[PDB]
Amino acid sequence: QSARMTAMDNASKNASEMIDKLTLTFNRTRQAVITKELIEIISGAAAL
Amino acid sequence: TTGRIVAVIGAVVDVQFDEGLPPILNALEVQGRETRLVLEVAQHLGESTVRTIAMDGTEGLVRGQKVLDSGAPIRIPVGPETLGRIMNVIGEPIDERGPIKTKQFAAIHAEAPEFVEMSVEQEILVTGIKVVDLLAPYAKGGKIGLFGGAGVGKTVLIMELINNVAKAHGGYSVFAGVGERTREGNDLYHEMIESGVINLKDATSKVALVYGQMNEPPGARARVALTGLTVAEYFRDQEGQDVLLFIDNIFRFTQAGSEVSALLGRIPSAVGYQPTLATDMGTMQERITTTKKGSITSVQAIYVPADDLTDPAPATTFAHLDATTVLSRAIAELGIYPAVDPLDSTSRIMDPNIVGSEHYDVARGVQKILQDYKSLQDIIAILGMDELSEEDKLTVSRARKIQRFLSQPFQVAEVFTGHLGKLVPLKETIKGFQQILAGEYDHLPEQAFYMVGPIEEAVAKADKLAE
Amino acid sequence: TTGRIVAVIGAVVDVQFDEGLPPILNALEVQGRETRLVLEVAQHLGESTVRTIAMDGTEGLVRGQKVLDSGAPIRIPVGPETLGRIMNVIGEPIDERGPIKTKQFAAIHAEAPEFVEMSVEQEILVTGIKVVDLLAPYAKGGKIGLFGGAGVGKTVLIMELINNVAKAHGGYSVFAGVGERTREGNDLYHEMIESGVINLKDATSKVALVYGQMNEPPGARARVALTGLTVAEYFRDQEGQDVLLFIDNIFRFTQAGSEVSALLGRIPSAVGYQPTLATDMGTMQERITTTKKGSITSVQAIYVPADDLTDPAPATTFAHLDATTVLSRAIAELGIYPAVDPLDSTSRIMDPNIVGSEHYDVARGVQKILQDYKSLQDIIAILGMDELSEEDKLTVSRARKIQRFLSQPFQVAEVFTGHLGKLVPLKETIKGFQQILAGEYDHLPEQAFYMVGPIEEAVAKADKLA
Amino acid sequence: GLCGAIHSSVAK
Amino acid sequence: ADTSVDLEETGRVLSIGDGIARVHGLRNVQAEEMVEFSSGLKGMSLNLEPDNVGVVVFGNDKLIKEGDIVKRTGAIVDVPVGEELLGRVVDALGNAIDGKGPIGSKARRRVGLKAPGIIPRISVREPMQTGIKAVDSLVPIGRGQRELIIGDRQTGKTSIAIDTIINQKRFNDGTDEKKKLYCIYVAIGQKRSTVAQLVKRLTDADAMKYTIVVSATASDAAPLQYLAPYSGCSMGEYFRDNGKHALIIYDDLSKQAVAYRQMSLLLRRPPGREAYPGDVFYLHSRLLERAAKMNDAFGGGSLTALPVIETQAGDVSAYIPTNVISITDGQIFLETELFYKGIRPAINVGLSVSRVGSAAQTRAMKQVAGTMKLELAQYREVAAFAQFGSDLDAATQQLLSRGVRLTELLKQGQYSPMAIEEQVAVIYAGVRGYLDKLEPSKITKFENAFLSHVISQHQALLSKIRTDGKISEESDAKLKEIVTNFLAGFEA
């Protein structure tokens, strides 16, 4: 019971950390897709 | 009128008329060519110059070349003498069997049926496919859409529906191949013949064919669907019959347009598409419809670029359908064919008031459990299965068996599955699932449920597997 | 011929001529300037106007200024008298040691050796670097590329190779500094002097140096590679010599191209790069090659922007190499140097019929275990090792010991590793890795393997760790 | 399970 | 009255840069016609504008200057075609580059011809044996079929193609002319030393004799790289239209797209999705539709294409990758994960397909591998679902036991294309369960031992399976006997 407690403390703390990282990775990606998709439109439009 | 070619850049040709400017949509014929080249007028640039889209190759055209206004949009041979035949974007036979002697001719461009012409009858159209029937029933006279990325089953599914439905159908059928594989029109034509749906000796043909494959210039691809659809509208209105319309693949109509779009001088909309995508799709999709005069049962294959269902094209097409079968490479990848996604497929008739509560409670019953299992998937992945409640490891069970019971050996894919094709009747389906959901087979092995028709084959297969 | 400057934008100078329009690639000299300003013609805009690329800053130029057709493309001193000398894009000495007095002059723009001129001999080039030798071995007269994001080890690896290979090479060497740091040119020059590869007293220098660094205007950076390249071509074909060609960094040439491209008025391709990216890399990369006349072993550092290997620049460079050393920030951050990615580096020599099956089987052995460790990592990441199978935990142990044994101290990086540089002989590498694979050291601790040369030193370190 | 190495230890 | 330079059949360069000439005059040129430059340099008329002709240049534009005279040729671009090219290395226009003399060509062919329509073809039915079990058993290739080889850099895509070319000696050295397959290998954007390496190996395998190599490498002008595929295609249609059989490898269609993109942007045509022309799909569809099977009415000849495409980060959903996957009759997807793991070829069973199915397979093969593909798909899934032995039944323990053994058999080395009956013998052993008790690690060694035995001792069973083309009831009995007994002696 002391080892399951310890193991589950860690697991839970790793999870949260993973959560915090994926979230930040998500926002970076979200911002780059928009920027990326918009530069693509501008390039096409300017070439005309 | 007679115009001259002033500029050639790919499929786009600009023409200058001295007197009398052909209206937009008018078809012009290029003079001096071994083969018939039609140019559809696309825009009035001003200065008595029109910008047009070529219906074929632009090689060998010359600046100054002559062009005659035909005085009307592309018009094709429409009528019963189109049945059993193979036509072009521009209505020319391409089957080497001579002219198509129709009484009338129709322009491929036309307005869509008015609001007061709509019909609202809703009859389930049983197909013999477990998944579709159970969860996303097709409807007679309704608009059906098969969505899928490259190589997930759109066409084979269209192939088994032609077999399980087109073949018994008492009425015509029009199969329009838009920007797909030439090999495929040759496979289907010869199959139609070997099964008498096409009769080369008599007038018993029950299917007209129109083709504008992937080896064609954007222009042809931006119009075959129109030609195809036009043939079908005739049997709907002028004869009043029950038509079956197959289009594979309507995405090609939209890709065709995006391919000339820049040469038409337009700022691109998102994802590269042309800014008129939705309206271009709207004025077309709105003709593919059942009216009070006749009924159309359209089955349209819809390609999904990069596998992304949010892509402006696939995305813009959902609204035009009454039933949708969404195929997924993630399912296919597991060997589950047809690879329909049970949680992303829908039908407007999945209503207790229309299919009944037994049909309805089973369907939703099957979907809840697959959803319930989807959610657990990522978690037992890491944390394993021991901690799960026997209540929850039973839904993992049943789900995995249902997941399989939803696959089926198609009669048009024996070359693929190495299994005889099975067609299951609506009641054999509802019942089979009802029992799995009821716990009545928690003893048989999952594998017993994979690639089988009716539930009895799953029971038999258990024994065969029993050793 | 005398033309007149009509327009000036950064490094793109447009010059109009009245009689006699210079062909494309011809070098023009601007008149009325304290120092030489060479303009390389790039295209005929029509109307007797030529659009050109300046080879130095264009400040001070004035519309209507006179320009003179040199009659040819940038030409530079070529021969053995360039050995031990430092030179410019336009071939002038910049080592304050006088004129480079050569018999011949070569133009920096040449065509690439023909198909029939190609060679297909494949000899392994041992470097003494464990990871490289074992997994993505270089090859004599071959084309090597070191891919690396900022500050990962590209230059340190070139230095160590210069040390381990260039130093005992019979034959010449050419170092071309393209778009990099000036201090580095200075660090190298003086170091070369010190170890005597550059001798300012006798004619015994074995290295010619060409530089167009981070401080030059785009056009200079866009051409110095061609210049170092030409020097090397002379030794190859005019003396049938076995050359060594080091370039830091060839990514800078492409970047330079992207800098002027808008000015040349071109619609950009993806990521803002010039639509001519591949062909520009191509007609240039295709002269850096061994032939029937001579051998060119070339090592090129390839800077990867934002660490993105899918970037048009680096992405388009893979196809030109025979061996690639892809450096990783992730590995570097673990403290493994050189930070080489073992599952991402490759070599057309990794063929049993060339390195022998012993080599070929240890090599594929190491990769397989690291690939296996790699897939377990996702789970190891949330739950650690506890839940792992006894079997799986042994791959993990071995993988982590193989990963550490792939690292090694470089003389060149002694000031940072805190350890004495090591050079491991191929058979020592094949071996040490066999045993690890074979479970002959499952008792030693990981740390024993970190930062060592031969396996024998890994056993020792283990005793010292007690 | 999910208690680190409780079982593996005794088993070992 | 010097009338040699009228502006109807000649023009003068208004400007030149980046390989695009804007020629004035050329009033009678046809779209896509070839023109000549004072410098002997050929170009192609792509944009016919009101006031100028946009000409793409097949070579270094450094020799072209404003004012140069440009002359029509009256001919739409074409190239040498025919048997003379076999064993020779040509550039994208037909010129030899093996410095082995002029080609003795008597025929020519337009590089850009539409693919034969519906009526002139017949369903693909004759196998096109690669020599690779994994391929010939799971993603069968028939003649007239287009099958794509796709995967990241270095996952082995070219190898599939070389092994295939090499496997064709079997029939080419034979008597039967219907079974023969002439090969064409188009290098695009590649490096000259790699191609030189390539043609060496082909020579060392005695395969050049039936191969033509069209090379359009890294330093060749964008327009040469662009054309190269159409050029090579046309040389393959010669065989296709004359009741002969051809096989063309487009290595790769990725670098061509880049070339197209470059050529196209330099013509000022507005960039589209991902910077490529709005018609890159069309660029490849047009080409690959040409690979085809003609009916007996047209000679019964055929053209089979094996185009290569490079993915990035194994992402097959990518726009170009799917553009091309949606044209061919299947794909062979190679993964680096599988490759490193030991699975070579790195064929990904689940993601690869053949739209021809067993119709492109001999009955012997169909007999043994008829359901194997979906079996391995279903195996990969459960193998994942139990990466935690979740109280697994028997039907799935059996499923995992076959799955692993079968996976080992599909493994294969390089340059050793197997004969169809050889494949049937070894798959047979696995598919029938005779190997379910052997240790996975043993399987590769066993296959070398077993195959040795039957090839040496039993060529009567091999020649019958090969000949009958099927597995009769007695052959099937002679085989059961051999495997089970040899297996036992083998596990002594």
Q: What is the CATH number of the domain that holds E462?
A: 1.20.150.20
Joined together, the tokens standing for residue E87 give 């064993």
How far is the CA of C434 from the CAs of C293, C339, C374, C455, C456, in angstroms?
40, 22, 20, 10, 13
Q: Please state whether C17 falls in left (phi above 0), alpha (psi between -120 and 50) or beta.
A: beta
- SS3 assignment, position B410: coil
First to last CA, chain D: 16
CATH number reported for the structural domain that contains residue E173 in this entry: 3.40.50.300
H/E segment holding residue E234: helix E222-241
* Beta partners for residue C3, in sequence order: C17, C67
| CA torsion angle E331 E334 E335 E341 (round to 10) | 140
Q: Would you call D5 and C386 a contact, using CB atoms and an 8 Å cutoff?
A: yes
Q: How far apart are CA B330 and CA E316, in angstroms?
A: 13
Strands (E), B222-322: 242-248, 295-303
Task: Name the packing angle between helices B455-466 and B426-437 (round to 10°).
Answer: 60
Task: List every span in chain C annotated with CATH 1.10.1140.10.
Answer: 350-466
Residues in chain D: 12
- SS3 assignment, position E134: helix
CATH number reported for the structural domain that contains residue E53 in this entry: 2.40.30.20
Closest to C375 in 3D by CA, of C361, C365, C388, C360: C388
Joined together, the tokens standing for residue B241 give 């019959």
* Closest residue of chain C to E269, computed from CA coordinates: C267
In this structure, are residues E252 and E188 in contact, taking their beta carbons and an 8 Å threshold? yes
Domain architecture of chain A: domains with CATH:
8-48 (1.10.287.80)
| CA torsion angle E384 E388 E393 E398 (round to 10) | 50
User: How far off is chain E from A47, nearest CA to CA, in Å?
Assistant: 6
The angle formed by the CA atoms of residues B218, B220 and B226, to the nearest 5 degrees, is: 120
Which of chain A's residues have a Cβ under 8 Å away from the Cβ of C383?
11, 14
Q: How far apart are CA E164 and CA B458, in angstroms?
A: 41
Q: Are residues E131 and E248 in the same domain?
A: yes
Q: Please state whether B101 falls in left (phi above 0), alpha (psi between -120 and 50) or beta.
A: beta
Minimal Cβ distance to E278: which of B9, B64, B262: B262
Asked if C381 has any chain B CB less than 8 Å from its own CB, the reply is no
Q: How far apart are CA E142 and CA B178, in angstroms?
A: 25
The experimental resolution of this structure, in angstroms, equals 6.0
Contacts of E82 (CB under 8 A, 6+ apart): E105, E106, E107, E235, E238
| DSSP 8-state secondary structure symbol assigned to residue E58 | S
Q: How far apart are CA E429 and CA E415, in angstroms?
A: 23
Q: What is the sign, positive or negative, of the torsion defined by CA atoms of C86, C300, C244, C163?
A: positive
Q: How far apart are CA B225 and CA B233, in angstroms?
A: 12
Q: How far apart are CA B446 and CA B83, in angstroms?
A: 46
Instruction: Tell me the CATH class for B1-73.
Output: mainly beta
Residues 352-371 of E with CB under 8 A from C: none
Q: Please state whether B409 falls in left (phi above 0), alpha (psi between -120 and 50) or beta.
A: beta
State phi, psi for E207 to the nearest 5 degrees. Answer: -110, -20
Of C75, C143, C154, C404, which is the active-site residue? Answer: C154
Other residues' Cβ atoms within 10 Å of the Cβ of residue B351? 13
Q: Are residues E312 and E459 in the same domain?
A: no
How far is the CA of A20 from the CAs of A10, A11, B376, C383, E110, in angstroms?
15, 14, 22, 17, 61
Q: Which of A40, A42, A48 to mutate to test the interface with E (most CBs of E within 10 A)?
A: A40
Q: How far apart are CA C261 and CA C257, in angstroms?
A: 6
Q: How is domain B350-467 classified at the CATH fold level?
A: 1.10.1140
Residues in chain E: 492
In this structure, are residues B321 and B144 in contact, taking their beta carbons and an 8 Å threshold? yes
> b or e along E226-246 (b: 16 or more beta carbons within 10 Å of the residue's beta carbon)?
bbbbbbbbbbbbbbbbeebbb
Which of chain A's residues have a Cβ under 8 Å away from the Cβ of C384?
10
| DSSP 8-state secondary structure symbol assigned to residue B162 | I
Joined together, the tokens standing for residue E308 give 């290569």
In this structure, are residues B230 and B284 in contact, taking their beta carbons and an 8 Å threshold? no
Q: How far apart are CA E221 and CA E211, in angstroms?
A: 24
Q: How far apart are CA B78 and CA B85, in angstroms?
A: 11
H/E segment holding residue E475: helix E473-490
Residue E116: is it exposed, middle or buried by C-beta count within 10 angstroms (0-12/13-18/19+)? buried
Instruction: State the chains in contact with A (3 or more Cβ–Cβ pairs under 8 Å).
Output: B, C, D, E
- SS3 assignment, position B108: coil
State the alpha helices, DSSP H only, in E289-394: 319-325, 336-341, 363-369, 372-385
Residue E219: is it exposed, middle or buried by C-beta count within 10 angstroms (0-12/13-18/19+)? buried
Report yes or no on chains D and E touching (3+ CB pairs under 8 A): no
Where a domain ends, among E56, E75, E94?
E75
* Closest residue of chain A to D5, computed from CA coordinates: A3
Q: What is the sign, positive or negative, of the torsion defined by CA atoms of E488, E490, E491, E492?
A: positive
Q: Which CATH number fits domain C350-466: 1.10.1140.10, 3.40.50.450, 3.40.50.2000, 3.40.1360.10?
A: 1.10.1140.10
| CA torsion angle E382 E383 E388 E389 (round to 10) | 80
Q: How far apart are CA E229 and CA E238, in angstroms?
A: 15
Which of chain A's residues have a Cβ under 8 Å away from the Cβ of E268?
47
Is-cis flag, bond preceding C113, omega within 30? Answer: no
In this structure, are residues C410 and C417 in contact, taking their beta carbons and an 8 Å threshold? yes
Task: Name the packing angle between helices C426-437 and C390-405 (round to 10°).
Answer: 160
Joined together, the tokens standing for residue C397 give 């142990």
Q: How far apart are CA E3 and CA C407, in angstroms?
A: 76
Residues 250-289 of E with CB under 8 A from C: 255, 258-259, 261-262, 265-266, 268, 270-271, 274-275
Rg (CA), chain A: 21
Task: Answer yes or no: is E412 a known binding residue.
Answer: yes
Joined together, the tokens standing for residue E402 give 């076959």
Contacts of B66 (CB under 8 A, 6+ apart): B2, B3, B4, B5, B30, B31, B32
User: How far off is chain E from B352, nearest CA to CA, in Å?
Assistant: 35
How far is the CA of E491 from the CAs of C382, E121, E400, E403, E485, in angstroms?
43, 52, 22, 21, 10
First to last CA, chain B: 80
Closest to E63 in 3D by CA, of E91, E46, E39, E87: E39
How would you write chain C as a 3-class SS string?
CEEEEEEEECCEEEEEECCCCCCCCCEEEECCCCCCCEEEEEEEEECCEEEEEECCCCCCCCCCCEEEECCCCCEEEECHHHCCCEECCCCCECCCCCCCCCCEEEECCCCCCCHHHCCCCCEEECCCCHHHHHHCCEEECCEEEEEECCCCCHHHHHHHHHHHCHHHCCCCEEEEEECCCHHHHHHHHHHHHHCCCCCCCCCCCCEEEEEECCCCCHHHHHHHHHHHHHHHHHHHHHCCCEEEEEEECCHHHHHHHHHHHCCCCCCCCHHHCCCCHHHHHHHHHCCCCCCCCCEEEEEEEEECHHHCCCCHHHHCCHHHCCEEEEECHHHHHHCCCCCECCCCCEECCCCHHHHHHHHHHHHHHHHHHHHHHHHHHHHHHHHCCCCCCHHHHHHHHHHHHHHHHCCCCCHHHHHHHCCCCCCCCHHHHHHHHHHHHCCCCCCCCHHHHCCCCCHHHHHHHHHHHC
* Closest residue of chain E to C265, computed from CA coordinates: E266
Q: How far apart are CA B260 and CA B218, in angstroms?
A: 7
B285, amino acid identity: Q
β pairing state of E20-25 and E10-17:
antiparallel
Q: Which residue is it, tokens 């300003």?
A: C37
Task: List every span in chain B annotated with CATH 1.10.1140.10.
Answer: 350-467
- SS3 assignment, position E232: helix
| DSSP 8-state secondary structure symbol assigned to residue E4 | S
Q: How is domain C74-349 classified at the CATH fold level?
A: Rossmann fold (3.40.50)
The angle formed by the CA atoms of residues E261, E159 and E178, to the nearest 5 degrees, is: 95
Q: What is the sign, positive or negative, of the torsion defined by CA atoms of B285, B287, B291, B295?
A: negative
Rg (CA), chain B: 25
Q: Is residue E175 part of a domain?
A: yes
Closest to E181 in 3D by CA, of E212, E137, E136: E212
Q: How far apart are CA E352 and CA B50, in angstroms?
A: 47
Task: Answer yes or no: is E2 a known binding residue.
Answer: no
Q: How many CA atoms lie within 13 A of E362 on its CB side?
A: 18
Residues of E carrying an active site annotation: 355
Joined together, the tokens standing for residue B229 give 């659809």
Q: How far apart are CA C166 and CA B462, in angstroms?
A: 70
Other residues' Cβ atoms within 10 Å of the Cβ of residue C102? 17
Closest to E134 in 3D by CA, of E312, E333, E305, E308: E333
Where a domain ends, among E29, E45, E75?
E75
Contacts of D11 (CB under 8 A, 6+ apart): none
Task: List every span in chain C annotated with CATH 2.40.10.170.
Answer: 1-73
Q: Is residue E1 part of a domain?
A: no
Total count of domains within chain E: 3
In this structure, are residues C172 and C327 in contact, taking their beta carbons and an 8 Å threshold? no
Closest to B257 in 3D by CA, of B7, B2, B11, B5: B11
| DSSP 8-state secondary structure symbol assigned to residue B412 | T
Closest to E193 in 3D by CA, of B86, C160, C54, C320: C320
Which of chain A's residues have a Cβ under 8 Å away from the Cβ of B271?
37
State phi, psi for B200 to the nearest 5 degrees. Answer: -85, -10
Q: Are residues E104 and E58 in the same domain?
A: no
Contacts of C396 (CB under 8 A, 6+ apart): C373, C376, C380, C385, C388
In this structure, are residues B213 and B265 in contact, taking their beta carbons and an 8 Å threshold? no
State phi, psi for C312 to the nearest 5 degrees. Answer: -40, -45
E360, amino acid identity: A
Residues in chain B: 467
Residue contacts between C and D (CB atoms, under 8 Å)? 6
In this structure, are residues C241 and C294 in contact, taking their beta carbons and an 8 Å threshold? yes
The angle formed by the CA atoms of residues B67, B71 and B76, to the nearest 5 degrees, is: 100
In this structure, are residues C43 and C11 in contact, taking their beta carbons and an 8 Å threshold? no
Joined together, the tokens standing for residue B293 give 């005069």
Q: Which residue is it, tokens 């494309």?
A: C24
How far is the CA of E455 from the CAs of E287, E423, E465, in angstroms?
41, 12, 12
User: How far off is chain C from D5, nearest CA to CA, in Å?
Assistant: 6
First to last CA, chain E: 98
| Structural domain harbouring E376 | 362-492
- SS3 assignment, position E360: helix
Residue B81: is it exposed, middle or buried by C-beta count within 10 angstroms (0-12/13-18/19+)? middle
Which of chain D's residues have a Cβ under 8 Å away from the Cβ of B380?
none
Asked if B382 has any chain C CB less than 8 Å from its own CB, the reply is yes
* Beta partners for residue E89, in sequence order: E213
B95, amino acid identity: D
In this structure, are residues C63 and C8 in contact, taking their beta carbons and an 8 Å threshold? yes
Other residues' Cβ atoms within 10 Å of the Cβ of residue B267? 16
Q: How far apart are CA E188 and CA E191, in angstroms?
A: 9
Q: Which residue is it, tokens 């051809």?
A: E246
Rg (CA), chain D: 6
Asked about B180 being catalytic, the answer comes back as yes
User: How far off is chain C from D9, nearest CA to CA, in Å?
Assistant: 11
How far is the CA of E211 from the CAs of C171, E83, E94, E217, in angstroms?
40, 10, 14, 18
Q: Are residues E379 and E274 in the same domain?
A: no
Task: Answer yes or no: is C424 a known binding residue.
Answer: no
Which of chain E's residues have a Cβ under 8 Å away from the Cβ of A42?
none
DSSP conformation letters of E156-184: SHHHHHHHHHHHTHHHHTSS-SSS--EEE
β pairing state of B208-212 and B173-178:
parallel
- SS3 assignment, position B261: helix
Residue C424: is it exposed, middle or buried by C-beta count within 10 angstroms (0-12/13-18/19+)? buried
Joined together, the tokens standing for residue E144 give 């007239």
In this structure, are residues B15 and B4 in contact, taking their beta carbons and an 8 Å threshold? yes
